[PDB]
Amino acid sequence: PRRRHTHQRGYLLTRNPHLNKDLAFTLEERQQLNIHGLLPPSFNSQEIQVLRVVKNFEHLNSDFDRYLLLMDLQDRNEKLFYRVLTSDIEKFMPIVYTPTVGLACQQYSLVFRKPRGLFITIHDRGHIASVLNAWPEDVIKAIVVTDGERILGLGDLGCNGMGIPVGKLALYTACGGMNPQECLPVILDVGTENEELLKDPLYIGLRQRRVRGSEYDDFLDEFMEAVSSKYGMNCLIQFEDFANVNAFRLLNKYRNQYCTFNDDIQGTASVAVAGLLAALRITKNKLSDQTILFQGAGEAALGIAHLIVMALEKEGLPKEKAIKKIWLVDSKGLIVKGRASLTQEKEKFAHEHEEMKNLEAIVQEIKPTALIGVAAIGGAFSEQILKDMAAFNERPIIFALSNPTSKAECSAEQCYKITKGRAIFASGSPFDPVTLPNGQTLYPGQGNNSYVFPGVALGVVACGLRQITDNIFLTTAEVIAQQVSDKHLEEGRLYPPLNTIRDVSLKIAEKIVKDAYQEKTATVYPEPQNKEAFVRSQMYSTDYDQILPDCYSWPEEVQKIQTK
Amino acid sequence: PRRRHTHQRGYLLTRNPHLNKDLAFTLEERQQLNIHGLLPPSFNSQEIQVLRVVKNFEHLNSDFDRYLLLMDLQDRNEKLFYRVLTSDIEKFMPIVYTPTVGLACQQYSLVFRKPRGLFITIHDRGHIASVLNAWPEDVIKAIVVTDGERILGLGDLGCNGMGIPVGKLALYTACGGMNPQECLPVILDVGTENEELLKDPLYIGLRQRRVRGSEYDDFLDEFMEAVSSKYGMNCLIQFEDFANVNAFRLLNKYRNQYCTFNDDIQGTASVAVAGLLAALRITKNKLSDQTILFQGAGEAALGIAHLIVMALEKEGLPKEKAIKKIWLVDSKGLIVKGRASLTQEKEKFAHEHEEMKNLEAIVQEIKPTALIGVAAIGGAFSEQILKDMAAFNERPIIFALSNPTSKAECSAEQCYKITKGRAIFASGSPFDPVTLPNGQTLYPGQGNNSYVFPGVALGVVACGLRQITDNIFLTTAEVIAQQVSDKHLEEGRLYPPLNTIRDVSLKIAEKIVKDAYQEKTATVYPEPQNKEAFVRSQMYSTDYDQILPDCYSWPEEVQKIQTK
Amino acid sequence: PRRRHTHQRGYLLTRNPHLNKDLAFTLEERQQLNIHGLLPPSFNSQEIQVLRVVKNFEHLNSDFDRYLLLMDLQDRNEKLFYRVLTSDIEKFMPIVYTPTVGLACQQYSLVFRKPRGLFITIHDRGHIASVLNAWPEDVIKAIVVTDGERILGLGDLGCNGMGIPVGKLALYTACGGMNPQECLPVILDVGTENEELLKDPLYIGLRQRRVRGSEYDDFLDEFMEAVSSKYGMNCLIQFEDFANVNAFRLLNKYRNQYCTFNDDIQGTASVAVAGLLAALRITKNKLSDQTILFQGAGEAALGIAHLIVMALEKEGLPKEKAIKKIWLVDSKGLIVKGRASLTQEKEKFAHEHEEMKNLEAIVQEIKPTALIGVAAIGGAFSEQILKDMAAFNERPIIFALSNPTSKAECSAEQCYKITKGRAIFASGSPFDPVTLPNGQTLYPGQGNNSYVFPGVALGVVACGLRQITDNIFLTTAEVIAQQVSDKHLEEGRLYPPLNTIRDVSLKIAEKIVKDAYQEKTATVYPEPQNKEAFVRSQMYSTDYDQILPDCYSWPEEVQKIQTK
Amino acid sequence: PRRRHTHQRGYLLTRNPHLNKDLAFTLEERQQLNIHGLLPPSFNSQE
Numbered sequence A, B, C: 001p002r003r004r005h006t007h008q009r010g011y012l013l014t015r016n017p018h019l020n021k022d023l024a025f026t027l028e029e030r031q032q033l034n035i036h037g038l039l040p041p042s043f044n045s046q047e048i049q050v051l052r053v054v055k056n057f058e059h060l061n062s063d064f065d066r067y068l069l070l071m072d073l074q075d076r077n078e079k080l081f082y083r084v085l086t087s088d089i090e091k092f093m094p095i096v097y098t099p100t101v102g103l104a105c106q107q108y109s110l111v112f113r114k115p116r117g118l119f120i121t122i123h124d125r126g127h128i129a130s131v132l133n134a135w136p137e138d139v140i141k142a143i144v145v146t147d148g149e150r151i152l153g154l155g156d157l158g159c160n161g162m163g164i165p166v167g168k169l170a171l172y173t174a175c176g177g178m179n180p181q182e183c184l185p186v187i188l189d190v191g192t193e194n195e196e197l198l199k200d201p202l203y204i205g206l207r208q209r210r211v212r213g214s215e216y217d218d219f220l221d222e223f224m225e226a227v228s229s230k231y232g233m234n235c236l237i238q239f240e241d242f243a244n245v246n247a248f249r250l251l252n253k254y255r256n257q258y259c260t261f262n263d264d265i266q267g268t269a270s271v272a273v274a275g276l277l278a279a280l281r282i283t284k285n286k287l288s289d290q291t292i293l294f295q296g297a298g299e300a301a302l303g304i305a306h307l308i309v310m311a312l313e314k315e316g317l318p319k320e321k322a323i324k325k326i327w328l329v330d331s332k333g334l335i336v337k338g339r340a341s342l343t344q345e346k347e348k349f350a351h352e353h354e355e356m357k358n359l360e361a362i363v364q365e366i367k368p369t370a371l372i373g374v375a376a377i378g379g380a381f382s383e384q385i386l387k388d389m390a391a392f393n394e395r396p397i398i399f400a401l402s403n404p405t406s407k408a409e410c411s412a413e414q415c416y417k418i419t420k421g422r423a424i425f426a427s428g429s430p431f432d433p434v435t436l437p438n439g440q441t442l443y444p445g446q447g448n449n450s451y452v453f454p455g456v457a458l459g460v461v462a463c464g465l466r467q468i469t470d471n472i473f474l475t476t477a478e479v480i481a482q483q484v485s486d487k488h489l490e491e492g493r494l495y496p497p498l499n500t501i502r503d504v505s506l507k508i509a510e511k512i513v514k515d516a517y518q519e520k521t522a523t524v525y526p527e528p529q530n531k532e533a534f535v536r537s538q539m540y541s542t543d544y545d546q547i548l549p550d551c552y553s554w555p556e557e558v559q560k561i562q563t564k
Numbered sequence D: 001p002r003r004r005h006t007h008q009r010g011y012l013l014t015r016n017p018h019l020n021k022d023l024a025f026t027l028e029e030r031q032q033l034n035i036h037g038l039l040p041p042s043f044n045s046q047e
């Protein structure tokens, strides 16, 4: 059992969620910590505390209510919170994170109770260092930061966006073993364009429009300097839920000098590629053999596309051959050389070709082996698309990644029905198992970002990686796919079970760490004997620490009170 | 505004519900307190904070949910909690106290989240003083203590009875202006005879049967020494929800030596007598002239009967004559001289008479002018009973005090219908107004303990009364009756409106204070010239204290830094 | 200024020597820190504070009393302490360190007032980690540890030796700008061989003889692990005043794994070599042209000679031929091949020659160009030896490094007299300037270890050097030599003035930093543009930090308290 | 003896002259109060 020898005592100790064990404090602990009397006279194991929380949890009426209970728990007893979450990760993850946290964010100003994380405003420009001083933990190793401009698929929720870093970091700990005491959730509030928040008497954020331009850019620059300067260059800074243009610009500006990544961009690319690589073990061919069409050409599309191209390069295909294997379709139709409304990013995939608008005709023309939906238009993979995909391919790869299911390009039911059970399918949001007329039940998995960010963070931090390369994400994808068993693939699953996520994370971290020592990118020395054991030692446990003073005697001769 | 300069700073300040203002902290406060950045960047007035709480309160679906919300509030921001409560005292009183606190106590072990008050067990015997040391407020002026043996009419709830002192003290503050920082809810856990709880894995108390006899009595003795020793002999100790024999025994043992009362006995007495004194203004006769019949002969009845006797003595009637004006019925029937099953206390009212069992007959024989239900038998005041009462009395006084409504001896509807609108009626649980055939609308009042205890406590503590005499409760009954206007009486109310409870408490306190300095019973000197203003100055306000340091300049010459 | 935002307030703030300004706190600072009233009502500039201290210092009767006064200052107001020291380092250095600290250590148990530093005993074996936890500063970058077995020339002073690490770390700050808050003095008490201490009722250490052997070695291993584990592998650990065999064994065992050095061995080497390199600018010839005779063969001689050999090798000489340039004399006389009583270390200088035991004849035989005294035998450089050195050499280099004065191999007076003014002289202890017969005055300097260790520590920590090589000491010696002007060399000074010592340290650290980036040994990234400005930014100023909260407004619109 | 239960621990406890016993703090007091290591390893009676 770990130590932690606190100087805190009495009432204020019970107010620190990292020290407070509530009823799991033993009589000895209570008396020694000067809190005996502040708790009822029973001693609970952690399991009994978990039963109590779960009894409450079940009598609630909704997931939002269940979220409120769990956030209350987080703010009173951090270890019990994590014990609860880890006790059934697949059940608790969608409560503290997506999709429920979506509603939590929409509702954040109304239900606002106890604050979590640090709020830094445009009006703190020049003072970010001193805002950091307000945070009561000095040793921070991981920051998740948002500006609330692009929350999930809900858009600009300004300061209400604070629900995202808080819940995301809960998953860093629960799924990846990051120390919660070492994690800092951050919102930068530069204003909001959210009309309802601007009108709303209860809104907790700055009641102003967003600050744009170089004032915004300088602010972010100060943010990066203040945080790395205070917590050291090794501190991970993860961007979440910024607007695309911002997310891309900020990632490119900083990635080469700070320990930073953007999960919406790079993590998405990673888990999508993991799924593709897993699928390859069913189609029994190479990435090189694929023709990939993206339904959508936005942040997810370009991120995934980028990473696929490197995977192709890694197979031994030159960049320009690599690129020609990938077609995009945006809201105006296929991306072709010299089409109107193209961006610099879309341009990279604008091959010479007739312009087309109709996705059915696009499918018939391109004949992809892999069709990836990241456009947020529900039902875009029509019956005709699915028949055509199953006609051109023995085992068509079909990813409906748009969330929630009401947005999915197709359902698993339609996908398997129309492709006569031949499709290799993955989704963004959970679909139930599907049983074919031959009595086999297929279990389509989700390309959940959680498979990526926890392990990456743990890896990067454990070995002191100063930079987070594209290769980190490609490597990570290979590790995930590797955890998928032949048995899983045969059941139609392209991702390891969600209930294993702790282990998947461990393996991702193991690999990054192993790699870092081998290519001398690690900064933590001396090099560990055993890389598995070392990563494990860096992982937060849900068991309570001991916090009692270390008490031990000396030989009586030298322990005696001298007199004369 | 009150100035209270805190030395607390940073995170831990926000964790103290006496310091924490939430979003009502100004920018200046936040920066000065080293918490700037721990809150979202909006600044709320107290009225805006209330609105947030009320919106959430109105989204909830049960009184229990409402109770849990307000209790979470109490533990985060005490001032805002009291601001919410006092915003609509009549609405909020039944949520934080009775009847809702009844369910809270049944569910206490299940919903246990953030502890409140001080738990002292039989096993801390000989160490009570060191248990007290855990309480983070040194200055304590009021204590409510239970052993949980008799929580409401719910029986032995042992350690689950902590809901009662906590909720009771909330009303001390809300209704009487007692400073919550100076209030200490206590449970003594000596075990429980509650069998579900002894079996309940979640039970927060000592999983054992109650300690009885002299070990119990000695423990209580230590409690009174430790408490009076630490907080001084002026600290008010109120007993609540003890079993019958204990309640009387403890009250009798200590009331002469400590500043102590029992509210189930003496407060009930005071509020019942107040309703009688008010009724007398309708029946236009003396207390002398009354014949009182109690349905029930427990804590309530015996307390009420004692104070009526004391009132009769005041008017000038000898004690043995006063006693003969009062008859009691227990579960065994009428209390008469030389009946089987008589406690020492019931003996005092056993007059020579034929034994009787049936309440209808008893009423027909005794022909009371006033009939008081304190037996918790619902519907005991049958049509025949009421008919009888209206037959022998021009204006029969009828108190149906049993709680809740289901246990009331009759409804207001029944009582008025069957007595042809003639009865003077009061109850323990609220009934809607009744409009009679003659176009009169009557508004039957509730004999709420809340009219009494907050004012008594405020008064006693304000002037430093060392003992709480019978006289205090009688004068209190008088003060309460005085706040009833003839308009009220003509409307059939025997109590002031509930929404004026703060004003009632002040008048009660004013009276106690004036009396104590008159009869030199006060211990707080020098005597204030203006007792009204002095009491008011002792009342807690729901406005935020200023906690920032006192900043002010000195003349230039003496403020300057000395160099050369 | 520099900003250090504390959460401490009220009395306890004044008790923290890093926060306390005493009378230099402004009225604003006082009111804001909740300490207004705890100080008399005058506001002093730091200079006024210094004037008060120095007046007190000048009225005292002994250097011992002055030491106690300054040590009392250190423990009340750290910044003022350092301000005082640095106002006249030549004056104050000999009070807080040698020779006064020698007497302090002899008297430590008698005068023990307020503790300084951390005490770790053999009896804490297995629990050193938890002893570290008592230290109130979490961020430690420099540790000075002794076991007290060889304090100065006063032998084994056991626990009383704690005065050495305290006084040494004062010089690290005063002379080199190490942050004292980041410094940790440590005594390891494994017992003492000092019989008078063992007998003394007041002795503050373990009343037992020294644990030897594997138990000792394992204890030291845990210490290294515990300290490097808590404070990190970049934390500088400097050994001081261990017995010889221990000092060497420990240094060799750890120098390749930990960021460690031993100042008695390696710092002595560096400063002595610096003096030699400076002398070469008078003799105007090369190091390889010298013949060096050591009076003594102890820790100092072996260490100095080792570094001379390296400097010769650098100039271009193979090792075996450089060794030939150095002759050692011990208590059994000259070291020569096959001789009785030879340690393996002496063996390295055991050349082919006949045994001799008379220093005078040894001189006459060897005809050294350089005579280095480190044998502690007062007066060993006799008039005859001084005549011989003057006869064989135009400018004989003569170092009487033995400490204090009474142990010097010769005085400045005698050296200059008998060598008729041509000796190039330096000592370990200060001698007054010497007026020669021709009325010119020479100013022999001191080979004071303070020229070396402050700058080495500053440099190593600034760039995060993980190991401290012999080259560091050689380079450092060169840098110090470079700081000596020609004019100084003509005044008989081999060392830069003590009053520039901060500047010397800065130069030394600049050089270490410049080299560490050049040769890819630095661990602090990114690489700074200006090494000079970088090092200087890391140096602790004696100017008071600002500790008030950072207060600043927001535009009126967003700072406004919101209502309805 | 009289008992005064302090919530103060570690370095700052030693800076309170009503709490601080110097070398009269026993090894157990020192370890309990999180000050073990801040004093030399001998225990003094008041005399």
Ligand SMILES: NC(=O)C1=CN([C@@H]2O[C@H](COP(=O)(O)OP(=O)(O)OC[C@H]3O[C@@H](n4cnc5c(N)ncnc54)[C@H](OP(=O)(O)O)[C@@H]3O)[C@@H](O)[C@H]2O)C=CC1
Binding pocket: A153, A244, A264, A268, A271, A295, A296, A297, A298, A299, A300, A301, A329, A330, A331, A332, A373, A374, A375, A376, A377, A401, A402, A403, A404, A407, A427, A428, A429, A447, A448, A449
């Ligand atoms: N791990 C997962 O499960 C993840 C799933 N996703 C899902 O992917 C979807 C897209 O996300 P993201 O890339 O961030 O969103 P963006 O807004 O960046 O991308 C939207 C893209 O869809 C395009 N589009 C809109 N209508 C059509 C249409 N009718 N036909 C073709 N393309 C169309 C837009 O076109 P234009 O460029 O012309 O506007 C744009 O290219 C979301 O539903 C998100 O939930 C995202 C990340 C992770």
Ligand SMILES: NC(=O)C1=CN([C@@H]2O[C@H](COP(=O)(O)OP(=O)(O)OC[C@H]3O[C@@H](n4cnc5c(N)ncnc54)[C@H](OP(=O)(O)O)[C@@H]3O)[C@@H](O)[C@H]2O)C=CC1
Binding pocket: B153, B244, B264, B268, B271, B295, B296, B297, B298, B299, B300, B301, B329, B330, B331, B332, B333, B373, B374, B375, B376, B377, B401, B402, B403, B404, B407, B427, B428, B429, B447, B448, B449
């Ligand atoms: N201000 C208010 O609203 C207050 C209301 N009350 C109400 O009064 C009621 C009694 O409270 P309390 O006095 O504390 O309770 P106790 O339990 O102390 O007394 C109950 C009495 O009722 C008697 N009783 C039981 N059954 C019958 C029966 N069938 N016929 C006649 N008498 C019977 C019991 O008889 P025995 O002695 O034989 O057991 C006992 O004397 C409760 O319902 C309570 O809510 C109380 C205080 C204040």
Ligand SMILES: NC(=O)C1=CN([C@@H]2O[C@H](COP(=O)(O)OP(=O)(O)OC[C@H]3O[C@@H](n4cnc5c(N)ncnc54)[C@H](OP(=O)(O)O)[C@@H]3O)[C@@H](O)[C@H]2O)C=CC1
Binding pocket: C153, C244, C264, C268, C271, C295, C296, C297, C298, C299, C300, C301, C329, C330, C331, C332, C333, C373, C374, C375, C376, C377, C401, C402, C403, C404, C407, C427, C428, C429, C447, C448, C449
């Ligand atoms: N910067 C400075 O000014 C420094 C000065 N010094 C000074 O140098 C002196 C030596 O210190 P250190 O080397 O640590 O001490 P040690 O005790 O390690 O070495 C002393 C040496 O003197 C030898 N010796 C003893 N008697 C004689 C003799 N009659 N003739 C010749 N040699 C003799 C001893 O011989 P054996 O091996 O036979 O015992 C031993 O070699 C001390 O006075 C110290 O103050 C030291 C470090 C730094």
Ligand SMILES: [Mn+2]
Binding pocket: A152, A240, A241, A264
């Ligand atoms: Mn996101």
Ligand SMILES: [Mn+2]
Binding pocket: B152, B240, B241, B264
């Ligand atoms: Mn009660």
Ligand SMILES: [Mn+2]
Binding pocket: C152, C240, C241, C264
């Ligand atoms: Mn030394």
